[PDB]
Amino acid sequence: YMEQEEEWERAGLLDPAWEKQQRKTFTVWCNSHLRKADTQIENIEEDFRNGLKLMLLLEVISGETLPKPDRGKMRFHKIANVNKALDFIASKDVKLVSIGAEEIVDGNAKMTLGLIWTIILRFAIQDIEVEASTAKEGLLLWCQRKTSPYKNVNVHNFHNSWKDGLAFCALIHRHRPELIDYNSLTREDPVRNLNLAFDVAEKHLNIPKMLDAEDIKTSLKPDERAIMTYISSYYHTFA
């Protein structure tokens, strides 16, 4: 009973601020891959309902070919396409704990964001191996190692450790010192630091601006899934 709401709490999906952060961040992440297939989404709670761009997203990030999709106005075609997506994901050793094609075709916001996170996790994070840690803990360890020389960075988590922008700027500076005047930065202007990292990463590293500095600024504890999504692109660009 209320198993789904317990999982949604931990997913961040009951908090509307975290839901909004995931909606915005996940849309940019999906488009950072769909661009390679010359298309895009606009509204993540509408534009996957027929399964077509979901299947395409999975082909791009996996390099594999999925079965041919159906087309037709009628719902059962959309259900079939979403099920082809879900089958492909499950085939990569993913436990789809209560994600059904019907809710995706229905455009249920929480299930759709949960599904996109499942995809980000499996394909962008799960295989990360850093020392003896894997997946999310490996990604966090990478961040801790790469930012260890910076005295004004202390990465403990994927939320408030990232709020003042210095950790993002440090990750960039550690790989490319010529792009960031790191010593000029301080904790006093977090929005400046955040936007610096986001602008530099978009310009020089081809990493789109998945995070909104204003959403981070106003949150005492920003959404972990959104921040992990963005940092996963840092990881795969440098490592």
Author numbering: 37 to 275
The paper states:
The genome of malletwood is the only known plant genome that contains a gene coding for an α‐actinin‐like protein. The results clearly show that this protein has all properties of genuine α‐actinin. The R. argentea α‐actinin‐like protein dimerises in solution and thereby can cross‐link actin filaments. Based on these results, we believe the R. argentea protein represents a genuine α‐actinin, making R. argentea unique in the plant world.
In order to characterize its structure and function, we synthesized the gene and expressed the recombinant R. argentea protein. The N‐terminal actin‐binding domain (ABD), with two calponin homology motifs, is very similar to the ABD of any α‐actinin. The C‐terminal calmodulin‐like domain, as well as the intervening rod domain, are also similar to the corresponding regions in other α‐actinins.
